[PDB]
Amino acid sequence: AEKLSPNPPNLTKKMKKIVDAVIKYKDSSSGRQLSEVFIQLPSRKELPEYYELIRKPVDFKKIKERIRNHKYRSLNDLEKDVMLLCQNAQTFNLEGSLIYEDSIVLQSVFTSVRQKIEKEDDS
Ligand SMILES: Nc1nnc(-c2ccccc2O)cc1-c1ccccc1
């Protein structure tokens, strides 16, 4: 595939900062790193069923590659992919499950982290 045009540096920096904070997030009481199940998808071969139900699979490793390769052209584009990761979790897993509910929390963490980074960049 053709190399894409680099984003402006501050935009890439904010993308990387947002995703790093979402990844690093830990439940305040328990210390559990909610992102840990979302770093790396299972194989189409350990879990072929995942790929039958989920049209556009994505994990945090893929999101990080899509930042590096400039596939996202705005924070909106990054947000869409994080929220797609979480939607996919919600599609595949049962309401009430650890994976489903953790994805809902990470949606809120993404929003909060983005908001802090945006507010503190407005100078
Ligand atoms: N049940 C799951 N639901 N979702 C993901 C998942 C992982 C990364 C990104 C999005 C996901 O939706 C993984 C499992 C999973 C993990 C290990 C063995 C089997 C399934």
Side-chain angles (χ1 to χ4, degrees):
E2 286 310 297
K3 183 172 172 192
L4 299 177
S5 177
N7 280 314
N10 199 40
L11 180 60
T12 297
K13 178 185 161 180
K14 286 190 289 209
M15 296 173 174
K16 292 182 173 199
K17 290 183 173 297
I18 291 164
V19 168
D20 191 53
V22 169
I23 291 171
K24 281 175 175 167
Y25 175 87
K26 286 176 168 180
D27 179 280
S28 69
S29 69
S30 72
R32 187 166 65 84
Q33 190 166 3
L34 308 198
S35 64
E36 68 145 12
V37 292
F38 301 116
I39 301 305
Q40 182 179 339
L41 260 172
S43 53
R44 191 166 191 163
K45 184 169 130 191
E46 114 177 85
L47 200 69
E49 65 255 47
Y50 186 90
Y51 294 89
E52 298 177 349
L53 205 71
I54 300 306
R55 303 286 311 161
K56 296 210 171 160
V58 52
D59 53 22
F60 285 112
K61 284 180 22 190
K62 189 57 175 293
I63 291 171
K64 285 182 170 182
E65 173 166 28
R66 291 170 170 165
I67 296 166
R68 173 169 42 78
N69 278 335
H70 325 285
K71 190 181 180 189
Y72 308 131
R73 303 312 295 180
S74 61
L75 298 184
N76 199 59
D77 287 345
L78 171 63
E79 178 164 344
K80 285 167 78 179
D81 243 8
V82 171
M83 295 304 168
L84 176 65
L85 186 162
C86 294
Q87 178 202 294
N88 289 342
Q90 295 156 216
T91 302
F92 185 73
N93 292 285
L94 297 174
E95 295 162 342
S97 69
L98 179 139
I99 296 179
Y100 181 118
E101 303 297 336
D102 286 349
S103 84
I104 292 276
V105 177
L106 290 177
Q107 294 167 356
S108 70
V109 171
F110 181 98
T111 295
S112 58
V113 164
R114 176 178 175 182
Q115 178 176 66
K116 182 184 182 253
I117 284 164
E118 288 177 326
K119 283 185 170 189
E120 290 197 328
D121 188 58
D122 185 3
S123 306

